[PDB]
């Protein structure tokens, strides 16, 4: 957030947090999983050829 994009005319700074929510979040929001209707995650495994 504290990243510096530009410095302004009145002298104030343009921080990245000024022009962006900055949050921790998924690389993708493609998969949403659920065990018995409850919040979940998992990894399915695919046995290697042979």
């Amino acid at each position: 957030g504290k990243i510096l994009l530009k410095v302004n005319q009145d002298g104030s700074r343009v921080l990245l947090r000024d022009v962006a929510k900055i949050e921790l979040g998924g690389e993708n929001y493609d998969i949403i999983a659920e065990f018995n209707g409850q919040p979940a995650s998992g990894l399915g495994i695919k046995l290697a050829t042979g």
Binding site: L4, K6, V7, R13
Partner: protein
Amino acid sequence: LGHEKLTQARNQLLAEAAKHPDMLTSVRPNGLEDTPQFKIDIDQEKAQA
């Protein structure tokens, strides 16, 4: 946990280890001890200007 915390853990175990000479000799760390280093941090703003 991070380096520091592990380094503690390690010492705990390593100290607790070396107080049973009855059974366990030369319990040592195989790696290296932390050391000093000279960090040349840049002021971003400053460079911009």
